[PDB]
Ligand binder design. Structure first.
Ligand SMILES: Cc1cc2nc3c(=O)[nH]c(=O)nc-3n(C[C@H](O)[C@H](O)[C@H](O)COP(=O)(O)OP(=O)(O)OC[C@H]3O[C@@H](n4cnc5c(N)ncnc54)[C@H](O)[C@@H]3O)c2cc1C
Ligand SMILES: Cc1cc2nc3c(=O)[nH]c(=O)nc-3n(C[C@H](O)[C@H](O)[C@H](O)COP(=O)(O)OP(=O)(O)OC[C@H]3O[C@@H](n4cnc5c(N)ncnc54)[C@H](O)[C@@H]3O)c2cc1C
Ligand SMILES: NC(=O)C1=CN([C@@H]2O[C@H](COP(=O)(O)OP(=O)(O)OC[C@H]3O[C@@H](n4cnc5c(N)ncnc54)[C@H](OP(=O)(O)O)[C@@H]3O)[C@@H](O)[C@H]2O)C=CC1
Ligand SMILES: NC(=O)C1=CN([C@@H]2O[C@H](COP(=O)(O)OP(=O)(O)OC[C@H]3O[C@@H](n4cnc5c(N)ncnc54)[C@H](OP(=O)(O)O)[C@@H]3O)[C@@H](O)[C@H]2O)C=CC1
Ligand SMILES: N[C@@H](CCC(=O)N[C@@H](CSSC[C@H](NC(=O)CC[C@H](N)C(=O)O)C(=O)NCC(=O)O)C(=O)NCC(=O)O)C(=O)O
Ligand SMILES: N[C@@H](CCC(=O)N[C@@H](CSSC[C@H](NC(=O)CC[C@H](N)C(=O)O)C(=O)NCC(=O)O)C(=O)NCC(=O)O)C(=O)O
Lengths: 461, 461
């Protein structure tokens, strides 16, 4: 039994960040990783997605070429060219992260970890045992797929993991789900020329976002050629002579249900959610508490119910983002190795960007959330809608919408929501201001930058 | 003599903004405008510039088309296409601003105003007199050109005003000056295919910006095909059989001066500075104080030395930006018509974006300025240099540089400087944070947005 100061299960965003910080603090740490370092974000998440987004963005801008005085750009996108370059980039990152661990003197244990029956919390990886007075579980999650039992032929569709393995652009694609990944994939496939449908259970996407965003986002998708099938769900999928055939039920409220077959489908993509990866950890050998979806339960300091066992990131199932896992992993290292007992992550005011077309940025409370928190009488919003100057000369248009949610008489800024060109890079600094407790006066007293989209947020009336 | 509550001389950024706010407050106002409403920013400044920048940006992105899996885009930019659309857009804005005044019940007096000899401050426009207990001078400025006396043939070159009248892309262009307009014009001309030289008196552009920016900017220009002629100045210009021929002296320190002729120049563009437009106002009839360049002198509340006479914007010659004139014009209206005596613009921490390639954003103190203000022992900077993920797959590269200037033990953020893709839209919110007095802790405690360039500012170590 080899002992360490800190054992980290999972070499993804949270696991890498926590191990690295702990090592800086003097801890003798090891990272257990069964697949590729960098975890979901590097291999099949943030990175490859952003590359594909940049690619789709190229497609769109190329539609405006002629408006801008250039000669028309003619054609066919070549999927394998970009696919090969994307894969190489990911390989580069895998090598970098491995180096990052080595330079920090962090041991890398390759293989799948599971807890043992042993009294003191101990793990086994390939027949060898390892132990530490502090063990971090950061095994992340995976894409959720339906059971053949409830949707026959569901196994014929792929997930976002499968998306990153595609070698050719699918002719016809159907995406099921209404959350960020669904929206992002539909947007990439459509821009690159796939005849895309997005199938959602209700009438809008991103229904958990502020209502101005879910509405606007649903519209922009339609404007960009994505067919949004509302109140629809898959009833069954089958392999026909040439592609898949999707049976769906459309149940608009106030209407009779109607069944429709979708033929000649090349790609059926499930983007219905993520499941935590805890199934094969042998948690129950230590009685570690999970919820009914398999998420590990933790307190505000990332503690599990078992002393010296912590969990961070996607496995805990809250705020499923790379930077959250990183921040929580880091705070935890300071608490354990720097004896900063108050060291923990504040889960309020975490900013998010959705790489749609145009991108979405949000931080803080939606209007409804502020209303429930402070009361209708105490919430005031400010909003704007405009056409970015970029489209002053194009036949193709997109809009920019922004909304500011204020609370109390002071008009404290409690939420910012926007969609529009530039929004992906614009959010960060306002997120700083919101975190600091800025009020509308603070925004208003900041001199604008002209001409930009960002200035609109500081001149709301 | 028609009397008003507020008379505004000049219908540009500051004049329009001040008149509009004053009218909301109940003032009976009139705007005197001799040319087109919208002033410099709309007609020959911010607006037409940004359109041309978006155009140049198209040119660059089109160089990356093939890297991104598309087929090569072949060719020739057509200047008149975009020129015509740009002009129309400007016409649209002129009509909008006229409407904006009318809806506010602001009178528009068309023609050139000048003060009279009359005891109580009174102006004349086309033989008619007008007076008000509060008169705002907001006549803006103009491009500076050399005297034929000092540079023979200087009148053969054009200024940024002339740039906006060009109907064809110049084959060969030489830009003289090293400030923002010079940098911006060189960047647009070069990207659109003009064989461009930028002639500067020293070794770097933007020498008043933080030194990381002047260095980086000078390099990025060279990388983008702009020939930067250092320690060079024009000695004379002459009209040859086919274009202009520019005689220049190059005086590198530690070397003998060398004279060079630049032949076959289509466009010589002077971007050496701006002069205030006060020459024809008859200021001296009221003894209004100006400096030796003709700028009107004001106090912190925009008062001139004469009671009931104020000046804002470019004419005062400080912080020559549209949003500054607007903010100062607005604050002034509140002070005069809302009796808010403390109402004035804080000229510290005004953010600026330079539309170079890539764009530059800056707010607050340069490292040197912080050093002079707090002392070397009390200043700490943090900086980063990286390749944006956009270029992970391109043969063409650009860099992103960021620098954070902190002061005292608290590490108050007193300056932010950066250059890179996305920087134009990224600045605004950090400018809010800086204005609020954020410290490095406040930035560090803000969760990052991944993957973006903006996150780099919140994860500096
Ligand atoms: C398509 C997609 C796009 C996304 N885009 C973004 C984005 O743009 N921005 C963003 O912020 N977030 C994005 N995310 C989310 C982000 O990827 C996750 O929040 C983040 O990766 C979670 O980090 P983690 O450390 O919890 O787990 P992961 O990064 O999943 O790491 C878990 C690691 O543990 C390993 N492992 C699991 N079990 C074991 C075991 N028993 N033994 C050994 N090793 C084990 C796994 O192989 C893996 O490498 C995206 C996700 C997806 C799926
Ligand atoms: C090429 C260029 C690019 C620029 N780009 C930007 C940018 O991207 N962002 C930015 O923030 N700033 C930019 N600026 C600067 C910005 O344009 C100025 O700071 C702003 O226009 C100054 O506003 P103002 O109200 O002082 O004067 P102006 O907008 O110049 O208005 C002065 C007005 O007064 C009128 N006038 C003058 N004298 C008289 C008289 N005697 N009687 C009647 N009418 C009179 C003039 O016709 C004019 O319309 C740019 C400037 C230039 C030249
Ligand atoms: O990633 P997230 O879990 O953030 O969101 C994916 C979204 O897809 C929708 N969804 C969930 N389960 C299913 C399902 N079985 N079939 C279709 N859509 C589903 C839900 O939105 P919604 O509730 O709008 O359908 C859900 O929030
Ligand atoms: O707009 P700004 O006035 O902001 O800057 C233009 C810049 O051009 C340079 N410049 C000023 N006068 C001349 C001149 N006569 N010839 C060449 N360059 C000049 C100066 O930079 P610098 O001092 O670096 O030459 C100046 O700051
Ligand atoms: N953000 C810019 C620059 C591009 C970029 O971020 N490139 C790196 C790979 S990002 S995916 C891996 C992820 N890293 C992050 O989330 C950034 C964290 C941030 N730097 C911070 O310090 O908080 C991750 O798993 N991190 C774990 C960890 O940091 O321990 C890159 O080049 N990495 C290689 C390297 O030099 O180390 C952009 O998007 O353009
Ligand atoms: N900023 C966005 C949207 C594009 C945009 O700004 N379009 C307007 C013309 S901008 S040039 C005239 C300038 N206006 C500004 O500087 C914006 C001021 C800001 N809105 C504020 O309230 O502080 C000006 O001279 N303003 C004087 C004044 O505001 O009184 C536009 O469409 N204007 C027409 C209109 O609807 O009124 C982008 O860049 O994409």
């Amino acid at each position: 039994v080899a002992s360490y100061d800190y054992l980290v299960i999972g070499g993804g965003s949270g696991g890498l960040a926590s191990a690295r910080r702990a090592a800086e603090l003097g801890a003798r740490a090891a990272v257990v990783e069964s697949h590729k370092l960098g975890g979901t974000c590097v291999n099949v998440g943030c990175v490859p997605k952003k590359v594909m987004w940049n690619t789709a963005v190229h497609s769109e801008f190329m539609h405006d070429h002629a408006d801008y005085g250039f000669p028309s750009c003619e054609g066919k996108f070549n999927w394998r060219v970009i696919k090969e370059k994307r894969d190489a980039y990911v390989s580069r990152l895998n090598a970098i992260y491995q180096n990052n661990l080595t330079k920090s003197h962090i041991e890398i244990i390759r293989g799948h970890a599971a807890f043992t029956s042993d009294p003191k919390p101990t793990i086994e990886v390939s027949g060898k045992k390892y132990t530490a007075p502090h063990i971090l579980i950061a095994t992340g999650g995976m894409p959720s797929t339906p059971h053949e039992s409830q949707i026959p032929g569901a196994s014929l569709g792929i997930t976002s993991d499968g998306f990153f393995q595609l070698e050719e652009l699918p002719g016809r694609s159907v995406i099921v789900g209404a959350g960020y990944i669904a929206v992002e994939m539909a947007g990439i496939l459509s821009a690159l020329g796939s005849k895309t449908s997005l199938m959602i259970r209700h009438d809008k996407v991103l229904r958990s976002f502020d209502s101005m965003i879910s509405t606007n986002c649903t519209e922009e998708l339609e404007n960009a050629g994505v067919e949004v099938l509302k109140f629809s769900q898959v009833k069954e999928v089958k392999k026909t002579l040439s592609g898949l055939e999707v049976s769906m039920v459309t149940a608009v409220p106030g209407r009779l249900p109607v069944m429709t077959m979708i033929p000649d489908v090349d790609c059926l993509l499930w983007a219905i959610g993520r499941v935590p990866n805890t199934k094969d950890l042998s948690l129950n050998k230590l009685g570690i508490q999970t919820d009914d979806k398999g998420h590990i339960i933790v307190d505000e300091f990332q503690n599990t119910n078992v002393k010296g066992i912590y969990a961070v990131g996607d496995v805990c199932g809250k705020a499923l983002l790379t930077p959250v896992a990183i921040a929580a992993g880091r705070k935890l290292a300071h608490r354990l190795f720097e004896y900063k007992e108050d060291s923990k992550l504040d889960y309020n005011n975490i900013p998010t960007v959705v790489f749609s077309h145009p991108p979405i940025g949000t931080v803080g409370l939606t209007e409804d959330e502020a209303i429930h928190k402070y009361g209708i009488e105490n919430v005031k919003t400010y909003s704007t809608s405009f056409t970015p100057m970029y489209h002053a000369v194009t036949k193709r248009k997109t809009k920019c919408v922004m909304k500011m949610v204020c609370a109390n008489k002071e008009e404290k800024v409690v939420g910012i929501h926007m969609q529009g060109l530039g929004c992906d890079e614009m959010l960060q600094g306002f997120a700083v201001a919101v975190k600091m407790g800025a009020t509308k006066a603070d925004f208003d007293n900041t001199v604008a930058i002209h001409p930009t989209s960002s200035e609109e947020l500081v001149t709301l009336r």
